[PDB]
Amino acid sequence: ENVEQHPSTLSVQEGDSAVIKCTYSDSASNYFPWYKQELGKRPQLIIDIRSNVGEKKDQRIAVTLNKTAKHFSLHITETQPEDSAVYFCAASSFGNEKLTFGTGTRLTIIPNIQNPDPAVYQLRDSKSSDKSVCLFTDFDSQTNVSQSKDSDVYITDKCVLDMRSMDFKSNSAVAWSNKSDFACANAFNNS
Amino acid sequence: QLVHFVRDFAQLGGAGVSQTPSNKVTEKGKYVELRCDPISGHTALYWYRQSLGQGPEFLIYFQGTGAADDSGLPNDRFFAVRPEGSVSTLKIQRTERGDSAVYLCATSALGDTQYFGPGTRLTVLEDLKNVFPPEVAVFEPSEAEISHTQKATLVCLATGFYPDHVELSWWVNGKEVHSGVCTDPQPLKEQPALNDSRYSLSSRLRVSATFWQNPRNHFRCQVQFYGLSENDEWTQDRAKPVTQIVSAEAWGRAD
Amino acid sequence: IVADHVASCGVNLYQFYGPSGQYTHEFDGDEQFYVDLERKETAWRWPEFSKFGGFDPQGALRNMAVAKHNLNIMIKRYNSTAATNEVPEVTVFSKSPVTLGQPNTLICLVDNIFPPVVNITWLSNGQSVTEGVSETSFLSKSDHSFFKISYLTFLPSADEIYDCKVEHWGLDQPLLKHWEP
Amino acid sequence: SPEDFVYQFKGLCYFTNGTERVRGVTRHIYNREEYVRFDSDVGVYRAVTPQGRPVAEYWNSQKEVLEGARASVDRVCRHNYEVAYRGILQRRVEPTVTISPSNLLICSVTDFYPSQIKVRWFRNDQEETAGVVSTPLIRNGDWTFQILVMLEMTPQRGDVYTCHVEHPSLQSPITVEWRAQ
C-alpha cells in the first residue's frame, strides 16, 4: 500500500497558485491529511479531508478528493514566501490508523522584489579570522548566483530576509576567502 | 465494502509533542535511546522514520501502554516502550550507519488525527575522529551599505564543523531575533570532493542604520553544535568536540 | 432492550492468563468471523459470509492493545479481584435425526464458561478422536460468561459410543458427557 | 488452578423495523462486571459500578471521545447493516421435519434459519394441545436451529397423526404423517 505524490519539486512566483497531486492504492482509505515541513522541523498538520467529502477549504489552502479515481490534491492560492517548505500527503483507513505518506514536494516560493538595487559590499574584517567577506544584496530574484569556481573561495546560495514593520524584503548571497588576491568587485554575476 | 467496528478507548505531557535532543551523534555499535513526550491525554503514540529527501515511514504504534502495531520495526535491534501510556522511548541496540535518519514522534487523541513532534536526527558515524565544532565569526556592516540604503547587514560565518547539523541564532540585547534574519538553508562543503569534508554556514542579520549606529546595541551570533557528551571517551590530540555553543559578538558603532 | 436484531461488532476479549485475546463479530447470536490474532488474519468459520463484506484484521490488534492497557488499569481499580471460576454445563445432542448408516454430526454445547479457558475433546469407545472435529469461538452471553460448541461428524452404528470430554478450572476432574444411539 | 483476570469490551447494535430505529451500546466489563456503559439512547457515558465513575466522568469531559461514541450508530451500526446485515437477513434454510416414536411421538424440526417457527400437532385433523410439550429453540451454532415438539398419545388402529410446520422459508406448510402401524 503506497501513496504516490507529484511533483517532487516546484517553484512558483509569489502570488501564483501551487498545486500538488497524490494518488493512493487502497480503496479503503478514508482519511487524507496534508503536512507542511520546514527545514529542521516536524511535519505540521495543515488540513485534512475524509472520504465523505469531495472538497474542503481553509483560508489560502484547498484540498480535493476523488475516491473513484483515488486522486487527492492540495491547492495553495496566492502563495506567500513562508509557504516555502516540503509538503506531504498521507492516507489511512478505518481499521488501520497508521499513516502512509507520499514522497514529498519541495515547494519554493520565488519572492517578488519590488525595487531591486543590486550591489556588492565588503564587510568589516573580524579580528578572529583571516577571511574577507563580500555581500551581494538587494538583487532581483531572477538574478543568477553561481557557486564558486575556485577551491579557496566560498559562495553561498541566495536567501531572502524580511524586515517587519518596514514592508521590506531583500535577497543576498555571501562570498568569502582568505586568499591574498580576493576582490569583492565581481566576486559574483550578472546584469 | 469493509465492515466497521466499535473502537475501544485507552483509559487514564504538554500542549505540543516534544522530542529532545534535536540531534544525536554517535558511532557504530553504540546503544541509543530516543525519547518522546506526548500531548497531554493523547492515547495513541506513533514513531515514524524519515530518511533524506523522503516521507515519514511507520515504525510502531502504541494504544495506551500497549503496542497496537509494531510491523514497521526494521529489525530486532529496534524496540520501543511506553510504560505509562504517556512518554515513549525508542531504543536502538548496536547502531549501524544505515540507522541514520530523523526519528519523528506523533501522538493522536484517539488514533486517527496525528500531530508530530520536531523530530530527533540520529547520525551514526564510522567513528568520532572527524567530529569538529564550528568556529564562529561576525563581520560588521559595510559603511557603503549604510550610506546607500540606510540599512546595515551583519554577517555571521560558522566554519569547519562536522557533522553537518548545527542551529544558528541571532541575539540582540538579550533576546533572540527573527526579523531581518536569513540563514543559508543548506551548509556548503569546504572540500566538495571529500566525504569527510567539514562544513560552513552563513547567516545575515539586517537592521536599520540607526539601530546599528547605537553603541548600546549588543549583537551576538550563536551556534549550537551537537557532538560528544562528557561521558564519551576521547583520545585524539585535540579538545574533545563536545556538544556546545560557539558564538561571536558585535556592538553598534556610534559613527 | 427490545429489538428485532442484535449485532456484536466487537466482542473484544482479553485475559491476563497467557496472556490471550479474542476478536469476533456476532449477528443474532451466531459467529460471522473471528480474527486470528497470531496470523493477523480475518477468518470466517462459515466461508459463506466472506461474501458479506471484508474486515481489516489490524482493527482487532488495535482493540487488543487497548484491552491489554485497560485490563491492567482495571485490575488495580478492583483491588486485584481475580475471576471466579464457574461450573460449565455440558450437553451432547445430534444435529439431525439419527439413522444408522446415515452420516450425522454430534454437537457438544459447553455453556456457562468462565473464565474463557477450556479443553473440549471427543472420545469414541473411550479413545480420543481427531478427525471430523471442529469448534466455534467463545461466543458471548448477556451475563458476560461464554459458551463454546464443538462438533464431531460421525457415522452412527452399533460399534461406536461417544463421549464429550471437557476440562475447566471450575471442574474438579474432567467432565465426560456420554452419548450413544 | 491459575489466577485469571478478564476484560471484555462489547459493541452492540440493536435494530428495529429495518434501520428506522437504531440503538448502539458499548459495555466495558471487568471479569463479569460491567463498570461503564455508553448507550446511544442516553448520549453520555454512565458508570455502572463505583469503579466506572472516574472513567465515565473523564470521557464525558472529552468532546472527541463523546463525539466518537455518538457517531458509532451511523459509522458502525448503520454502516454494517448495509454492508453485511441486510444480506445476512436474506438467508433462508428450510426445516427438515421428522416424526419418530420415543407412548410419545417426537416431531423433530431441524436445520432451519431464521428462528421463527410454528409447529402444531394434529390427530385425525383435530389439533392436539393438552398432550404437547416443546423444547425451547435450540441453537446449533452453525447458523441453524432445531426444535423438538413431543406428543403424548395412545395410538388406535386407523388414527392419523400430523406434524404441521410453518416457517418464513416456506410458501406453504410442511406436513408429515405418522400412522398407527
Side-chain angles (χ1 to χ4, degrees), chain A residues 1-40 43-163 165-191, chain B residues 1-229 231-255, chain C residues 1-50 52-130 132-181, chain D:
Chain A
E1 303 314 311
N2 79 308
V3 170
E4 221 199 302
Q5 177 174 357
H6 298 299
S8 52
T9 71
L10 178 61
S11 282
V12 19
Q13 306 292 322
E14 177 176 2
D16 287 342
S17 294
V19 174
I20 299 173
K21 310 241 211 331
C22 289
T23 63
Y24 57 96
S25 47
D26 189 347
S27 59
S29 294
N30 73 338
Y31 175 68
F32 305 91
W34 286 84
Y35 291 86
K36 169 182 173 181
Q37 189 182 30
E38 306 175 15
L39 285 180
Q44 167 200 48
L45 179 61
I46 55 169
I47 191 162
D48 58 30
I49 189 167
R50 285 175 208 271
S51 59
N52 64 324
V53 141
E55 196 177 23
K56 185 162 154 180
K57 294 183 186 178
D58 180 13
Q59 303 201 326
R60 289 189 298 106
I61 64 197
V63 291
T64 57
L65 172 61
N66 183 340
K67 278 176 304 192
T68 295
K70 304 191 273 191
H71 292 343
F72 63 118
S73 295
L74 174 74
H75 300 67
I76 307 174
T77 64
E78 54 208 47
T79 53
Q80 291 170 7
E82 105 285 303
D83 297 335
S84 292
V86 180
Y87 290 80
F88 302 91
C89 59
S92 67
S93 70
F94 192 95
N96 205 344
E97 301 158 297
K98 87 179 179 194
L99 291 168
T100 123
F101 288 84
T103 42
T105 292
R106 181 168 316 267
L107 180 60
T108 301
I109 307 311
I110 299 182
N112 165 66
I113 306 305
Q114 265 284 54
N115 309 281
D117 190 15
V120 178
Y121 303 101
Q122 187 169 347
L123 274 63
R124 186 179 174 275
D125 282 346
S126 180
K127 294 174 59 186
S128 289
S129 85
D130 56 341
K131 304 181 172 72
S132 308
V133 173
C134 322
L135 175 77
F136 180 24
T137 186
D138 297 339
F139 52 86
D140 185 274
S141 287
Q142 161 67 1
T143 307
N144 182 250
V145 176
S146 66
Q147 86 192 43
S148 181
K149 289 179 158 66
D150 181 321
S151 59
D152 300 324
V153 6
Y154 303 86
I155 310 189
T156 70
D157 193 359
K158 49 204 180 185
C159 165
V160 60
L161 88 244
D162 186 5
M163 298 187 310
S165 84
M166 300 260 72
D167 193 55
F168 182 97
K169 260 161 35 180
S170 57
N171 293 321
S172 67
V174 169
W176 76 88
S177 181
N178 63 11
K179 284 172 66 177
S180 47
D181 64 322
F182 181 57
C184 283
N186 196 35
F188 309 88
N189 300 117
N190 193 316
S191 242
Chain B
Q1 83 176 54
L2 282 65
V3 331
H4 288 176
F5 64 100
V6 172
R7 289 142 156 159
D8 200 350
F9 302 134
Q11 300 172 208
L12 283 177
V17 174
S18 306
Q19 298 180 244
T20 42
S22 83
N23 287 265
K24 177 65 189 61
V25 1
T26 190
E27 46 171 4
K28 298 195 303 178
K30 299 299 200 198
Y31 172 70
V32 157
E33 283 186 3
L34 303 183
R35 198 157 173 290
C36 173
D37 198 88
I39 291 166
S40 264
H42 276 198
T43 62
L45 185 148
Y46 301 83
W47 283 95
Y48 294 81
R49 162 204 259 175
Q50 185 179 38
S51 311
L52 188 56
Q54 294 186 332
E57 287 174 4
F58 169 74
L59 300 172
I60 187 176
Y61 166 26
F62 288 100
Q63 270 285 347
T65 51
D69 184 355
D70 59 9
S71 60
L73 294 179
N75 53 62
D76 42 279
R77 303 185 289 101
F78 288 76
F79 190 71
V81 293
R82 197 190 182 198
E84 294 166 325
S86 56
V87 178
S88 168
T89 297
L90 178 67
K91 311 175 180 185
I92 307 171
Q93 284 172 350
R94 312 180 303 272
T95 50
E96 309 174 7
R97 299 206 303 288
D99 300 338
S100 301
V102 176
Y103 292 83
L104 298 158
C105 185
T107 74
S108 177
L110 307 182
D112 52 288
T113 301
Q114 294 163 48
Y115 296 91
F116 281 88
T120 291
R121 184 181 289 97
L122 174 69
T123 300
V124 176
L125 303 172
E126 255 299 318
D127 56 68
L128 309 170
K129 283 180 191 165
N130 188 35
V131 175
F132 290 84
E135 293 199 313
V136 177
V138 168
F139 302 81
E140 296 185 353
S142 167
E143 299 174 16
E145 181 195 13
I146 285 158
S147 145
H148 184 75
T149 67
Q150 301 300 322
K151 293 165 189 89
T153 307
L154 297 84
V155 170
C156 181
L157 242 40
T159 58
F161 62 97
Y162 184 95
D164 44 325
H165 303 282
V166 293
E167 306 159 320
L168 191 155
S169 58
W170 283 95
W171 295 70
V172 173
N173 304 328
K175 285 164 179 51
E176 187 172 359
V177 304
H178 305 272
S179 188
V181 176
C182 81
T183 294
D184 302 332
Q186 299 285 306
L188 79 192
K189 285 192 189 178
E190 289 160 14
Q191 314 209 266
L194 289 72
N195 308 283
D196 255 335
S197 185
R198 292 154 65 176
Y199 289 87
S200 299
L201 186 66
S202 68
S203 174
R204 319 90 165 100
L205 165 65
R206 196 171 205 183
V207 301
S208 71
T210 61
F211 192 90
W212 170 252
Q213 282 158 348
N214 177 3
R216 290 197 51 82
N217 290 314
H218 184 197
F219 306 81
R220 172 152 58 228
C221 180
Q222 180 157 317
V223 182
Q224 175 75 247
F225 172 76
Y226 295 94
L228 280 58
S229 75
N231 289 332
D232 293 337
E233 295 189 355
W234 184 254
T235 226
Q236 313 287 122
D237 196 10
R238 57 186 177 98
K240 193 197 294 186
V242 297
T243 294
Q244 66 193 264
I245 291 171
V246 179
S247 68
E249 290 181 325
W251 276 269
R253 262 137 141 286
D255 220 12
Chain C
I1 303 169
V2 175
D4 294 343
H5 306 290
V6 59
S8 285
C9 20
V11 174
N12 303 255
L13 169 58
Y14 186 86
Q15 55 185 336
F16 204 70
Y17 180 87
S20 207
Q22 195 195 252
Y23 188 92
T24 53
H25 283 203
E26 302 171 352
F27 181 81
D28 282 340
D30 295 310
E31 178 172 8
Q32 310 169 231
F33 69 84
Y34 68 96
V35 176
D36 191 330
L37 304 169
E38 272 280 57
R39 310 178 70 93
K40 268 75 156 182
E41 211 170 39
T42 299
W44 290 266
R45 285 203 205 266
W46 293 272
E48 158 197 358
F49 303 88
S50 61
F52 298 119
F55 187 78
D56 185 339
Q58 190 52 233
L61 297 171
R62 168 218 196 272
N63 265 13
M64 284 299 106
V66 178
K68 183 185 188 68
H69 167 91
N70 288 351
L71 177 57
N72 293 329
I73 294 188
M74 295 317 298
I75 289 180
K76 294 168 158 180
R77 308 285 217 63
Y78 270 100
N79 283 23
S80 306
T81 306
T84 297
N85 296 318
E86 287 281 323
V87 175
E89 311 192 42
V90 184
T91 311
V92 180
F93 50 99
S94 74
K95 176 171 165 74
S96 37
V98 31
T99 271
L100 264 49
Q102 224 78 333
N104 215 314
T105 302
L106 274 183
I107 295 163
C108 188
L109 166 63
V110 183
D111 188 9
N112 196 49
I113 308 182
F114 200 86
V117 175
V118 78
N119 286 341
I120 309 172
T121 48
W122 294 89
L123 294 178
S124 175
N125 309 309
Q127 298 298 320
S128 60
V129 200
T130 302
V133 177
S134 56
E135 224 189 43
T136 63
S137 313
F138 291 99
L139 293 145
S140 73
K141 299 181 61 179
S142 74
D143 72 357
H144 314 318
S145 58
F146 303 81
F147 66 98
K148 183 188 272 279
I149 300 169
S150 179
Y151 307 92
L152 170 68
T153 55
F154 76 107
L155 198 45
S157 73
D159 303 324
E160 294 159 300
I161 59 167
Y162 316 86
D163 303 89
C164 189
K165 186 186 180 175
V166 176
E167 306 168 46
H168 188 281
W169 303 327
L171 297 173
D172 304 325
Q173 39 160 12
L175 195 163
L176 283 88
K177 213 71 177 198
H178 187 276
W179 191 94
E180 52 187 342
Chain D
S1 186
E3 264 187 332
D4 195 7
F5 306 83
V6 187
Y7 174 88
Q8 301 181 55
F9 171 66
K10 298 165 154 180
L12 293 141
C13 293
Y14 300 85
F15 302 91
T16 286
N17 174 22
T19 61
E20 233 93 294
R21 240 92 159 75
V22 181
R23 177 174 184 176
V25 5
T26 72
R27 301 179 195 286
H28 285 84
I29 300 161
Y30 176 73
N31 291 328
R32 305 281 300 285
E33 190 161 272
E34 186 183 0
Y35 59 93
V36 73
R37 174 184 308 168
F38 181 89
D39 177 350
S40 67
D41 275 14
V42 177
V44 301
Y45 286 90
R46 283 278 186 261
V48 174
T49 63
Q51 295 75 14
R53 290 177 183 152
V55 188
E57 192 181 25
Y58 180 68
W59 284 344
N60 284 338
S61 74
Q62 304 298 299
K63 59 210 58 187
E64 221 136 358
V65 176
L66 201 49
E67 291 312 322
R70 285 169 170 184
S72 216
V73 159
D74 297 324
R75 293 193 77 197
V76 180
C77 310
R78 288 187 160 92
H79 174 99
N80 282 6
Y81 195 97
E82 302 305 331
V83 163
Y85 313 147
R86 190 174 306 266
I88 292 169
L89 287 164
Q90 299 309 132
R91 166 174 170 89
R92 296 285 182 278
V93 187
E94 288 180 356
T96 294
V97 184
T98 307
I99 295 183
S100 155
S102 177
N103 320 280
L104 189 83
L105 246 35
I106 302 169
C107 179
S108 299
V109 189
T110 55
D111 295 340
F112 59 96
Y113 192 93
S115 64
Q116 307 84 271
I117 192 99
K118 286 158 63 50
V119 191
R120 293 169 170 100
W121 267 111
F122 293 84
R123 189 186 97 109
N124 301 335
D125 292 32
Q126 283 289 278
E127 177 170 16
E128 299 279 307
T129 54
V132 170
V133 51
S134 62
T135 61
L137 233 13
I138 298 179
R139 188 179 301 278
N140 290 321
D142 60 354
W143 297 77
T144 66
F145 299 94
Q146 63 177 285
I147 187 176
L148 312 196
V149 16
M150 278 61 60
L151 170 64
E152 296 277 351
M153 39 88 85
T154 296
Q156 306 203 82
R157 281 163 168 279
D159 280 348
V160 180
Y161 292 81
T162 136
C163 190
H164 186 273
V165 175
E166 302 172 14
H167 185 264
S169 76
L170 299 173
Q171 202 181 332
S172 74
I174 289 177
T175 56
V176 179
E177 283 175 6
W178 186 93
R179 266 159 218 266
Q181 57 289 39

